[PDB]
């Protein structure tokens, strides 16, 4: 079963909204990050450290929990790198789920 991500909510969002992160079809034991996404660049993807979750996926590869998603947050790196403010009224930002490898379901769109 290939990995996948759904966001209820997803669109009509507003700052400070609690969506429900839930996957399925992940590898079985494996943790994966579940954070706010935007690519800012080829190449380059932005996340929102201000408000982070990590699930661990059970025997049958599914998995849930909540995120707290924002309008605008000061944007990373996942190194640690600060890039900017990332804008989601403007930008394409989304929820994913990605493992220590930077693999997993999709990203999720989500609009505010």
Do not use: H, M
């Amino acid at each position: 079963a290939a990995p996948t991500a759904t966001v209820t909510p997803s669109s009509g969002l507003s700052d400070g909204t609690v969506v429900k992160v839930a996957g399925a079809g992940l590898q079985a034991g494996t943790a994966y990050w579940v954070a706010q996404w935007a690519r800012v660049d080829t190449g380059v993807w932005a996340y929102n450290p201000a408000d982070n979750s990590s699930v661990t996926a059970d025997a049958n590869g599914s998995a849930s929990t909540s995120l707290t998603v924002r309008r605008s947050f000061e944007g990373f790196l996942f190194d640690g790198t600060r890039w900017g403010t990332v804008d989601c009224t403007t930008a394409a930002c989304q929820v994913g789920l990605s493992d220590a490898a930077g693999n997993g379901p999709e990203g999720v769109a989500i609009s505010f």
